[PDB]
Subunit: 333 residues, 3 copies
């Protein structure tokens, strides 16, 4: 009887950070309560100042990472304020039935709903809006996030031994399709309805104009670079709700990788690069061994370095000359 | 000596249905006899009435699913009636030698041939036409199907326990490249030879105009929705002879997935979405737990909902409020 | 102390051949010394005579396959002669730290450098140039190769039994983006700097103009077809530094496949086709069972047969009619 279970209220944080949780469940199954507020907002997505009408959960692209344990119940209060103009809903790939919740969560501006589902399968999973007839438009406007469902005894390696992270980040990768005129310049629009047909036309090209992490070119760089220390164990959760990606830590590896994100499967070891299919979340575990700057990219390097799918780690600690050294520094001879 | 083996004649059915077979082999190895007749035909592939010159095995896109057991012999009589205009052949990815049979099966209109091969490896596999110099044109005109080679003791899970399906469907996913004029409208053509160069030009864009299941937008919807009941175990075989796909059951999962289709490998568990590479068949096993409508898509949702790669299940039975419920239905407050 | 280790000098060979090595390590850990010379050169990449300004390691596209064992040290002397015009560097996906070596290997024309790293993880791995701000331009100009890091006890199957190859080939697959004018014809350029913006524009289309093995359409055909004999065990290493590929042996299989190339993972068995993500090397083991001509392709068959991603094997030996036979040769009736 679900009414006899503990309830725990989660307070979300903005990606790439992740709300507090325990890897190994410190309680029995719980009803874990989340609230998200839909926000339609203008976002500047590149260095040129290109501004799109984003559709967000909780103000961010991606939406925040939700974390529960296997056989917890997720109870989400979804709020669509009357400052928004569109109908929205939510589909959890973690959930079973009713299009992952989308059939039960249709909220007009000025409405709210509360969905509950049982998180019966452990893994990282995409969640996304999906209103009948307008599904790719909402998703490719940024209206997607992820949920992690941890096994109750935490993560395990390919031999059944514990894998415990010290830090976790969530990288949401977003393909945008900003409509272009014949000359190649981006168009702007007076209303979503006046934008819709051109959004459909842009999407049908199948060719993104931008591919970004955390909502914009350069979002995970500078003062917002990801951080770690030598010897820290770091889990990077990575989602892509609509297109394939091929993540790569430049100067590192995925020591243990669930490329399609489901923890009952043994991870792939020692990956350079892995394929997260569109419509999937994946997760990579790495122990840093060298200090300095790393880039974290989609290893279609055009997508990375021309279209935006690149972030950075700044790693502190000591350099290991056994692992790598310059024997003779660049010089003329 | 193959002449001492039983012969069994199969009578194929139109996709997404699958001819009768036994999961666990009820006989020793057999010569399993199939006949397919090539049919060049006009097909309407979208709601707008776009009509292409399809190249089919047995009248359908995809061609029918053939089913045998490991170390059976497949003996295919392939008929190219003189009502057709082109040379055709067949390559089985299941087979060993002679380009998978393509080098031995070249049939002009008014010819037939009979190929035999030993099905030495268990899995689902693509078959497709492949005439030297015109290979992608035939394949992307719809001239591809799949063959399932079951292990003689049926399917097994990641621990070696039986997995037995109650129902099986075959979803063939087809990328078409309908040539377009400068304005973006589809062209039509008086002869295959007059169409060929424009077909090559359209293909070289690498950008499909349509991506469909069972030969047309909406083919697996309405009166042709796939069906199941709560508690039924369903195997969905999915092929894509030319491009990657990323299948997803909206509101469900792949409980056990052979993403690259080969049954000697343990399946991936609890998948949301998986990557079937172009040139591959994959297979997903799911036990339905909730009634209602499901969509089954390529989770590039543009490909799904704008270009055609979406079908439906209609599932009967009782709703499980433990697994999912609306706590508070959408309302204004 | 690395100075007490044996040093061994390798002399590289041109792809698709591979320098001499031992599968099972016949010594303890070594410092394995390689030298590569960067060469900017014009290359004709298709049958039409299309000529690009290639950026190569050691004169070839791909660069040569380097082979070491796990926990050897790779010591590479990288030479950028003053006959070249650009700055170059090298990132090893096999290595840990400093962007895989790229931060430590920046060489102007007329400079050289020597990098050492410890090959701590077994697998096939991409190496590629990656100069800050110009990374995809160098990679998609052909400036990438691969390194194999063998386990010290050689390769093993999914049960821990030895897999020993008789022959090894390296197939490097290269996506090129040759800039096109409005009419669709390729442009040429007077200087790299005058070419750069158009190269960026061509790349941002995400649509390759050419996809080739060993540097050109048809490179692995005719007098340069790959060879084998019936019963020989053949490892094909395949890299793609920038885009996904889906390799397939037409008429064969990957008996054992490390699709994402890392040998501590059990291989996938009996693959028809597999997905090597962009930014990855993979490796397929096959034992030939039939003589004759095979094609080895990217199984986007447009990419294969229209854009160049196809090579051939010529296999000697006896035909096995049990495995495949024509029962009735094509005839009219
Ligand atoms: O490893 N990044 O090119
Ligand atoms: O789960 N389909 O978006
Ligand atoms: O198997 N090659 O189409
Ligand atoms: Cu929405
Ligand atoms: Cu979805
Ligand atoms: Cu044909
Ligand atoms: Cu094929
Ligand atoms: Cu370079
Ligand atoms: Cu790289």
């Amino acid at each position: 009887d679900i009414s006899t279970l503990p309830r725990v209220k989660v307070d979300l944080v903005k990606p790439p950070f992740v709300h507090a949780h325990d890897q190994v469940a410190k309680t029995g199954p719980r009803v874990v309560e989340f609230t998200m507020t839909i926000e339609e907002k203008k976002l500047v997505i590149d260095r040129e100042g290109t501004e799109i009408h984003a559709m967000t959960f909780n103000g961010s692209v991606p939406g925040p990472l939700m974390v529960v344990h296997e056989n917890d119940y997720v109870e989400l209060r979804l709020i669509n304020p009357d400052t928004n103009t569109l109908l929205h809903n939510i589909d959890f790939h973690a959930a079973t039935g009713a299009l992952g919740g989308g059939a039960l969560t249709q909220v007009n501006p000025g409405e709210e709903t509360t969905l509950r589902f049982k998180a019966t399968k452990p893994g990282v999973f995409v969640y996304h809006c999906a209103p009948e007839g307008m599904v790719p438009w909402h998703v490719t406007s940024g209206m997607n996030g992820a949920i992690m469902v941890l096994p109750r005894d935490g993560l395990k390696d390919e031999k059944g031994q514990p894998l415990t992270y010290d830090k976790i980040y969530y990288v949401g990768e977003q393909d945008f399709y900003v409509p272009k005129d014949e000359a190649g310049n981006y168009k702007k629009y007076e209303t979503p309805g006046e934008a819709y047909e051109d959004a459909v036309k842009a999407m049908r090209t199948l060719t993104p104009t931008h591919i970004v992490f955390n909502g914009a070119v350069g979002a995970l760089t500078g003062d917002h670079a990801l951080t770690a220390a030598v010897g820290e164990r770091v889990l990077v959760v990575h989602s892509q709700a609509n297109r394939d990606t091929r993540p790569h830590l430049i100067g590192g590896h995925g020591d243990y990788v669930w490329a399609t994100g489901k923890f009952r499967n043994p991870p792939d070891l020692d990956q350079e690069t892995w394929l997260i299919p569109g419509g999937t979340a994946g997760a990579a575990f790495y122990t840093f061994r060298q200090p300095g700057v790393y880039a974290y990219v989609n290893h279609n390097l055009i997508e990375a370095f021309e279209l935006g799918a690149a972030g950075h780690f700044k790693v502190t600690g000591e350099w290991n000359d056994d692992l790598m050294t310059s024997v003779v520094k660049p010089a003329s001879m």
